[PDB]
């Protein structure tokens, strides 16, 4: 399984006596076991691209051939760990060496083999039974939140010949043995899957269930769906933290994966420092977010292969848990950094560049990356279902949208949560642009909304009309000063302000506004629009002659009602239950309609 | 140690520009250091760039003139370039190769480190905290440098970017509400400026805390590539092993990039965007990101790369690829220079992303954050009013506009204009800020909370 180094021209190492090797196989070059891949082959010689520095590699050094291509090691212990882009545990490398550096040629197993996991068989299988790929034959108890279901690796099947009894096993033991056509396969709790291959599913289903983030904006006006794909701008002042924390903390997904692609060292530190400090209430207990999270960390000075592979390692980990029946939400901190890594490799290989210097296949790689997301029917007899969502961010040089990476991304993702910096400067959070943002899942969710909430859909339509009209009126107001302006337009302007102030704006540093349940979001919007409609009628039905109602009359007449509408965001779901908050909102509507009644 | 006798080869297959192609070489390494002896007794250094079987190709640091293929001998060391490091080398001046040029002895090593090193494990990277004051008000009260960030100075050719760099070396230090060192590397520096740096540091007593590397414009271009690696290797030793804070200033990274392009051509690589290597991004990140704080140790490294913008275009790959992987920018302008303002630093286009953590109670002073934001707004408005004045005249202005013009004139004269030998600590810079802010009545200082005004505004 060894060959020899024939020569080094830089980061590219030529091997000889390496006839038995496949393209994009893995090699460990030299006495330090440098990680690299085989790209070009000719005769019994192979051209190796080495990820790390090749200084010190000699002619005649050994090359160890590893049969598996670039792959992710999947099994118990994946949760709570931080990985390199090529699946190297950073929390073990820093703790097994007492160093601050990642050793050159470091070789730490992705999943430690010194942990004795609590494994319980499915108790449904027997020796002699038939098992197929994707089947679950036992569960490992990792923590209080996520059960780690042990699946038969894809592309394997047969009759079960041995089942381990319940007990404490590590990742190097044998848990299940199966025989197919006389060939016996001994399986541990760990499976390996090539990172560039898509894990098969029974069928790919439409995405219909909303992604229940805690923000009123980026939900009511611009829905995302479990299994859907969106894009988030990444600029210093855009306030992207709000989405990252809200999505990872309060989402209705089961597993969070955060993927770095190649960011500034200090930015990776902020993410690695923040995440371990995040908690959420679960069964009444406050639990660490890292018990249901996995994180992949890559800084700009990491090997380019890892920065390019990081995005595929992340989604491979996501699919692994998807196949368990979990809903997984993966965030790519910057897909622009990934695209930069991809262009660097294309340049290093002297490939013909295309648009703005990027590889010709940039678009194909992004399209095939995002296509891997979605709600699926899983493999295996348990007939379970799950999904992968992607909320990958874009940060093109200059902030422009002409960069092929952002332009291609926007043509692929179905939701765009356009953020802005001006809003942040005005201290308006979350910093959502509104006019640029869009969601193409609105039709997919119409069945969910009709079934569970009924009035939500016409309300969000009216809300967009009111907000858009406020923008449309901007030129008239600037040139007029609200003097030569219709009273019906004054209602739109002031109500749109109410929406912008006490609905779309959300203050995550307050205990009552940490998470806004959907029923509260639609409750608040219903009463605000119901007021809008009543105010429009109050003016229009009396605007003929003699005695007419104006906005100044409405505002002065029922100022307490306009205040009560603004006060609605303070209804803390932790102390005031669903029935109490709905009851208070129902009373507000009645008080509101009755206040208008006195005007007619 | 190796304790293996060295082999010296007289077998030369040919010589092509900076490269010497050797033959029959036994198990050569890539990046191996070798020494040449020419027929005239002249010695040269070089490094092995390609090893294709027994045909090792070495790049000679100095010129290859005089080298034949019959008598020139090549001695192999059996190892790669490892720099002798110690604490004692602080206060010394070296050339790009790591040799002393201050008439002192060769470094008596405490260890040997591979100058390429390794990336710092992100899991143990600590977000930057306290501030390192520079002594220059324009970048202490407006865009401070956090103890662990990497913030570049972009300048056009002809601007006094080297005089500011020297001023930072003389004035920079800790806030002091003995453990601070500066490592200074100049790449492609001309003889006149090299003298400036060396003499200015020695004369003003700062040298005790400076480790200076000078790579001159007429020095080997490959040495220019290791120069910043030697500076950072020293910085890593001093910072992380000897528990102290190191400020690293890399001057004229544009000249580094040009030397890197030359190395790429030596390898016969096809040029990338605008002639530069396709791996320029990862090479700059390799240099820049070897900095910051680490868990469990009290040391830190900061960087202030200084870059000349070709044709004063921030779009150029050199400042573009740098800015894409650094945290903000200082930005030295030309208009301020032509107006004879020193330092000529423009606060409006500059940014320090880590300022939020650098400053505040327990690090500088309570009012630091508030003074900075208000000064920025007042300067931006003053410039806006000045532009208006040019259109409407003096008589068309109201009292508030005149106050902003008074601020604008006194801000540049008192706050930005400093001189090369006046060291303004963070507390004096803020006090100057308040003296300028007290031009306005309290109600015009919209960005300063009333609690801060009541404490600091009067008196």
């Amino acid at each position: 399984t060894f060959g020899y180094v024939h020569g080094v021209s830089g980061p590219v190492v030529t091997a000889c006596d390496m006839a038995g090797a496949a393209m994009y196989e893995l090699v460990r070059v030299g006495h330090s076991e440098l990680v690299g891949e085989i790209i070009r082959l000719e005769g019994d010689m192979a051209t190796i691209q080495v990820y790390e520095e090749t200084s010190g590699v000699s002619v005649g050094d050994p090359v160890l051939r590893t049969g598996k291509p670039l792959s992710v090691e999947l099994g118990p212990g994946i949760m709570g760990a931080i990985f390199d882009g090529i699946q190297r545990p950073l929390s073990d490398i820093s703790s097994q060496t007492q160093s601050i550096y990642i050793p050159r040629g470091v070789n730490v197993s992705a999943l430690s083999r010194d942990i004795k996991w609590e494994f319980i068989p499915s108790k449904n299988l027997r020796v002699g039974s038939h098992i197929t790929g994707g089947d679950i034959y036992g569960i490992v108890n990792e923590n209080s939140l996520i059960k780690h279901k042990i699946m038969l690796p894809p592309r394997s099947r047969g009759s079960v010949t041995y089942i381990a009894p319940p007990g404490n096993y590590d990742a190097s033991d044998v848990v299940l043995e199966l025989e197919f056509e006389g060939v016996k396969e001994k399986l541990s709790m760990v499976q390996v899957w090539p990172v560039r291959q898509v894990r098969p599913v029974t069928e790919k289903l439409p995405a219909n269930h909303p992604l229940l983030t805690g923000q009123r904006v980026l939900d009511a006006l611009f829905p995302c769906v479990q299994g859907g794909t969106t894009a988030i701008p990444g600029a210093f002042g855009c306030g992207k933290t709000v989405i990252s924390q809200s999505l990872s903390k309060y989402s209705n997904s089961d597993v969070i994966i955060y993927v770095g692609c190649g960011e500034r060292g200090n930015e990776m530190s902020e993410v690695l420092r923040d995440f371990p400090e995040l908690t959420m209430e679960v069964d009444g207990k406050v639990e660490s977010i890292m018990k249901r999270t996995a994180l992949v960390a890559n800084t700009s000075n990491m090997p380019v292969a890892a920065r390019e592979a990081s995005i595929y390692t992340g989604i491979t980990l996501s699919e692994y848990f998807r196949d368990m029946g979990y809903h997984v939400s993966m965030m790519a901190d910057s897909t622009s950094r990934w695209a930069e890594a991809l262009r660097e490799i294309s340049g290093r290989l002297a490939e013909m560049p295309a648009d703005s210097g990027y590889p010709a296949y940039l678009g194909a790689r992004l399209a095939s990356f995002y296509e891997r997301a979605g709600r699926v029917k899983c493999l295996g007899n348990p007939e379970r279902e799950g999904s992968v969502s992607i909320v990958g961010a874009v940060s093109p040089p200059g902030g422009d949208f002409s960069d092929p990476v952002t332009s291609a991304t926007l043509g692929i993702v179905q939701v765009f949560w356009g953020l802005d910096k001006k809003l942040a400067q005005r201290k308006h959070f979350p910093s959502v642009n509104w006019l640029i943002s869009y969601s193409k899942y609105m039709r997919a969710l119409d069945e969910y909304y009709d079934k569970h909430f009924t009035e939500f859909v016409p309300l969000r339509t009216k809300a967009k009309e009111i907000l858009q009209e406020e923008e449309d009126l901007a030129e008239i107001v600037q040139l007029v000063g609200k003097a030569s302006l219709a009273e019906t337009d004054k209602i739109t302007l002031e109500v749109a302000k109410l929406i912008k102030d006490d609905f779309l704006q959300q203050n995550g540093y307050t205990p009552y506004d940490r998470f806004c349940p959907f029923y509260k979001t639609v409750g608040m919007l219903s009463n605000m629009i119901s007021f809008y409609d009543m105010a429009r009628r109050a003016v229009e039905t009396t605007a003929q002659s003699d005695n007419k109602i104006t906005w100044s009359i409405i505002r002065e007449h029922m100022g307490e009602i306009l205040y009560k509408l603004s006060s609605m965001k303070f209804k803390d779901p932790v102390k005031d239950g669903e029935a109490k908050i709905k009851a208070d909102y129902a009373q507000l509507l009645e008080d509101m309609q009755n206040a208008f009644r006195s005007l007619e | 140690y190796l304790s293996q006798p060295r082999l010296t080869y007289k077998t030369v297959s040919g010589v092509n520009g900076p490269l010497v192609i050797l033959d029959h070489v036994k198990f050569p390494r890539y990046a191996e250091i070798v020494h040449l002896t020419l027929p005239d007794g002249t010695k040269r250094s070089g490094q092995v760039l390609e090893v294709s079987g027994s045909k090792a190709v070495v790049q000679v640091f100095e010129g290859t003139s005089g080298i034949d293929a019959k008598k020139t001998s090549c001695e192999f060391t059996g190892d790669i370039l490892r720099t002798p490091v110690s604490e004692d080398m602080l206060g010394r001046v070296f050339n790009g190769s790591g040799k002393p040029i201050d008439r002192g002895p060769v470094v008596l090593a405490e260890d040997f480190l591979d100058i390429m090193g390794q990336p710092i494990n992100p899991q143990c990277r600590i977000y930057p905290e306290e501030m390192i004051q520079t002594g220059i008000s324009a970048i202490d009260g407006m865009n401070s440098i956090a103890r662990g960030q990497k913030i570049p100075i972009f300048s056009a050719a002809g601007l006094p970017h080297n005089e500011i760099a020297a001023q930072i070396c003389r004035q920079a230090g800790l806030v002091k509400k003995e453990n601070f060192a500066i490592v200074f590397a100049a790449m492609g520096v001309n003889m006149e400026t090299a003298r400036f740096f060396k003499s200015d540091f020695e004369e003003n007593g700062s040298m005790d805390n400076v480790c200076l590397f000078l790579n001159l414009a007429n020095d080997p271009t490959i040495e220019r590539i290791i120069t910043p690696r030697l500076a950072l290797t020293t910085a890593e030793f001093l910072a992380y092993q000897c528990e102290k804070h190191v400020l690293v200033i890399l001057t004229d990274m544009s000249s580094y990039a040009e030397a890197l392009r030359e190395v790429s051509a030596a390898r016969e690589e096809v040029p990338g965007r605008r002639g530069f290597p396709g791996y320029m991004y990862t090479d700059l990140a390799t240099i820049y990101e070897r900095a910051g704080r680490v868990e469990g140790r009290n040391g830190s490294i900061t960087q202030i790369p200084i870059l000349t913008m070709p044709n004063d275009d921030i779009t150029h790959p050199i400042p573009d690829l740098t800015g894409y992987i650094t945290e903000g920018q200082i930005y030295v302008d030309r208009q301020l220079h032509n107006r004879q303002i020193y330092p000529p630093i423009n606060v409006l286009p500059s940014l320090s992303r880590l300022m939020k953590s650098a400053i505040g109670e327990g690090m500088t002073r309570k009012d630091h954050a508030d003074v900075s934001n208000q000064l920025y707004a007042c300067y931006a408005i003053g410039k806006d009013v000045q532009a208006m004045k040019a259109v409407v005249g003096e008589e068309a202005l109201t009292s508030d506009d005149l106050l902003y013009l008074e601020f604008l004139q006194k801000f540049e004269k008192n706050f930005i204009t400093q001189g090369p030998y006046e060291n303004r600590t963070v507390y004096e810079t803020l006090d100057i800020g308040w003296q300028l802010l007290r031009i306005f009545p309290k109600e015009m200082l919209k960005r300063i909370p009333q609690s801060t005004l009541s404490e600091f505004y009067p008196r």
Binding site: A350, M352, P353 | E268, V270, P271
Partner: peptide, 19 residues
């Protein structure tokens, strides 16, 4: 870029023929 790449390949071909 195209022309320079082809030039480098032609040089490589010449070098192989010489061996």
């Amino acid at each position: 870029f195209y022309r320079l790449k082809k030039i480098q390949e032609k040089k490589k071909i010449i070098k192989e023929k010489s061996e």
